[PDB]
Design a protein around this ligand. Sequence first.
Ligand SMILES: NC(=O)c1ccc[n+]([C@@H]2O[C@H](COP(=O)([O-])OP(=O)(O)OC[C@H]3O[C@@H](n4cnc5c(N)ncnc54)[C@H](O)[C@@H]3O)[C@@H](O)[C@H]2O)c1
Ligand SMILES: NC(=O)c1ccc[n+]([C@@H]2O[C@H](COP(=O)([O-])OP(=O)(O)OC[C@H]3O[C@@H](n4cnc5c(N)ncnc54)[C@H](O)[C@@H]3O)[C@@H](O)[C@H]2O)c1
Ligand SMILES: O=c1ccn([C@@H]2O[C@H](COP(=O)(O)OP(=O)(O)O)[C@@H](O)[C@H]2O)c(=O)[nH]1
Ligand SMILES: O=c1ccn([C@@H]2O[C@H](COP(=O)(O)OP(=O)(O)O)[C@@H](O)[C@H]2O)c(=O)[nH]1
Lengths: 336, 336
Amino acid sequence: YMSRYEEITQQLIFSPKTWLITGVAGFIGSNLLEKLLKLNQVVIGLDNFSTGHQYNLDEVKTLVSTEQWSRFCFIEGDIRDLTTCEQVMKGVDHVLHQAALGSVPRSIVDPITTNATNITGFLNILHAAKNAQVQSFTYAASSSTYGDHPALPKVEENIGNPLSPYAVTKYVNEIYAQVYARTYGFKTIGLRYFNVFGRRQDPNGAYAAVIPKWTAAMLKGDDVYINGDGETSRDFCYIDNVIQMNILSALAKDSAKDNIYNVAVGDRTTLNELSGYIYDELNLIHHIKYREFRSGDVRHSQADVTKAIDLLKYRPNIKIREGLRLSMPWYVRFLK
Amino acid sequence: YMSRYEEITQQLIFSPKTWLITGVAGFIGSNLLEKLLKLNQVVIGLDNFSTGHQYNLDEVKTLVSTEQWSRFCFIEGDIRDLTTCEQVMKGVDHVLHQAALGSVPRSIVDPITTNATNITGFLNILHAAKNAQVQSFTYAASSSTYGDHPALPKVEENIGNPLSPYAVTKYVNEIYAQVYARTYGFKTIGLRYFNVFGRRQDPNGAYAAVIPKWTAAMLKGDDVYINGDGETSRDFCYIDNVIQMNILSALAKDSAKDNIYNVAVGDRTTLNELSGYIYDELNLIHHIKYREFRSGDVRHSQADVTKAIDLLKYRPNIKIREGLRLSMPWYVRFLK
Ligand SMILES: NC(=O)c1ccc[n+]([C@@H]2O[C@H](COP(=O)([O-])OP(=O)(O)OC[C@H]3O[C@@H](n4cnc5c(N)ncnc54)[C@H](O)[C@@H]3O)[C@@H](O)[C@H]2O)c1
Ligand SMILES: NC(=O)c1ccc[n+]([C@@H]2O[C@H](COP(=O)([O-])OP(=O)(O)OC[C@H]3O[C@@H](n4cnc5c(N)ncnc54)[C@H](O)[C@@H]3O)[C@@H](O)[C@H]2O)c1
Ligand SMILES: O=c1ccn([C@@H]2O[C@H](COP(=O)(O)OP(=O)(O)O)[C@@H](O)[C@H]2O)c(=O)[nH]1
Ligand SMILES: O=c1ccn([C@@H]2O[C@H](COP(=O)(O)OP(=O)(O)O)[C@@H](O)[C@H]2O)c(=O)[nH]1
């Protein structure tokens, strides 16, 4: 049971609010959309369809009622444009900021456009929210910001040298949010996501994440490549745990704001054992090569989620094996 | 005898290089231009006259020869446009990046404009220089990067939380420069300036610095305002020490790069005593109210400049007294 999360969702159903989700047509954003509409929230969505898709919006339309879909206003637009940010902020109570161009290799190859979307666009959105006096502000940050700190598990207070432009941009979101608390009284929550996965995570394109990438390949019968020796390890985190942490953050008591939380489950899986689990799960639904290390890439990752457990009553419920089992049916339909 | 600095300066007289100076129409920038043309260098300038002034350029042309001036190619333009950055980088050897919007209180009122010039702009210039493979890249950092850290004097390796939107931008400049060393092998030198003063430091405008602001006010018989009890203290640094550090850094050996250096004198002067020293030096060239602390002010500021002295052979030869004597005539003229 996710008991605090249950309570807060009950509050929201009784007294519905207006939410802004940026990055709404993406993986996490469209999952957030799905959950908030199922709670009868009024949602304003902003996306530029850079890495996101019209079809993710279509899918969510089919998963919620007509009345629930009638409360969603989608705005095609770009967080880089301050005017657009100010416009979509109007009457908003809660901000969930997911719009960014992710990927560590992407930041290395084009630190410029990435800087514009992940720093300028984050600040545009943070400033507009402040000026609009929204009730809350929760933004996607990154475990990549631990960088080369060798300690396991990772605790929020202790970060190393950033190994990529992506690590920098997400770090800078954190520092702007802390300064906004200091200088305007404007209190936010940054969510350091660790390797999120699940439905509507894009399997296609040069930057696809390992889980949908591999699922896609295992299904096609293609080669499954491993960047390095496969001992590189991660805390894979099923999207529902992320959806919990956003909603808990949006309604956090004030003393729990102006903080950073790890968002994960606390487990460590190497690339090797994941190759296993994925094959296993897909094969129950009836259907290997080493290359060099990926540069900028973090070696090992396991979160410590005590802080979120403590301060927000976060209850991570779905672990890597069940999450894969929950996701593979989606990948089949989508890729059939 | 600044033997190292004199040595380097004698070499440049004999073997001219091409320098790019951003923020060339500004205080520190036009001081750098004056010095480099006097050494017969080739200088490309870039400035959008946002806080800088055509009249500073006109002034530098009065101080150098036709043939020296002939070697200054001036571009009116904006570091926020990447094409403009790459265009001024062509054939450059040494980059002196000074273009930015200074001022803590400016950044509190308008964090977006400050971000755009100080982060996007900086990154455009760093990226263009990396792509053009210049020999050296030296940028204007800030003592605001010390943030809330309680050490005093300030030493480069130990910094705290940044305390305003401006301070975030200047810290992010050093972070990007370190990640660029790490990821592309492009080694830069960041110069944490402390309270620079001297000729062509603008005395006019809401954001004028204390020494020119007070100087203007004393000449006019305007009220000299002291924010606080006047015991507040700074490590005021005459421009020629800053010019010195820029040229030592441009010609630094490789092991001296990817490093930050404080640029100041190492001395601490109070606001009360400064008012006294500005009065005295203006009086030999023949011709006060107490209000509340500026908010987000820093109480005491003083650099440890050991690392510069050691690694770069810096000589902080002009102290505040001498510097104010040298500057006072420039203000008298500029004002009558
Ligand atoms: N998936 C993960 O493992 C993970 C890990 C760390 C951080 N994050 C962060 O979580 C957030 C969501 O990531 P995701 O994994 O859903 O990826 P995603 O690419 O599926 O979604 C990002 C969405 O942002 C939109 N977008 C991008 N730039 C935009 C702009 N300038 N203006 C308007 N919209 C823009 C895209 O079209 C896309 O729909 C991002 O901030 C990302 O950096 C995700
Ligand atoms: N003077 C000090 O005490 C001090 C202290 C800390 C840091 N600095 C830094 O030193 C550098 C030089 O500062 P300064 O004191 O001479 O200030 P300044 O305002 O006199 O000069 C900055 C110059 O940059 C130009 N500029 C600003 N934005 C630009 C843009 N987008 N494109 C092109 N040109 C632009 C201005 O027009 C101006 O000529 C800055 O990076 C500043 O932040 C100065
Ligand atoms: O086809 C692939 C794609 C990714 N990876 C590796 O999987 C890990 C997780 O990468 P992902 O892009 O999913 O997330 P990251 O940890 O960068 O956010 C990284 O070490 C990648 O180099 C891999 O071995 N093969
Ligand atoms: O009219 C003025 C302007 C500034 N200051 C003070 O001078 C110090 C340094 O101010 P400045 O703006 O020169 O540079 P900063 O330290 O912000 O970079 C601070 O104590 C200010 O409160 C002052 O007492 N009176």
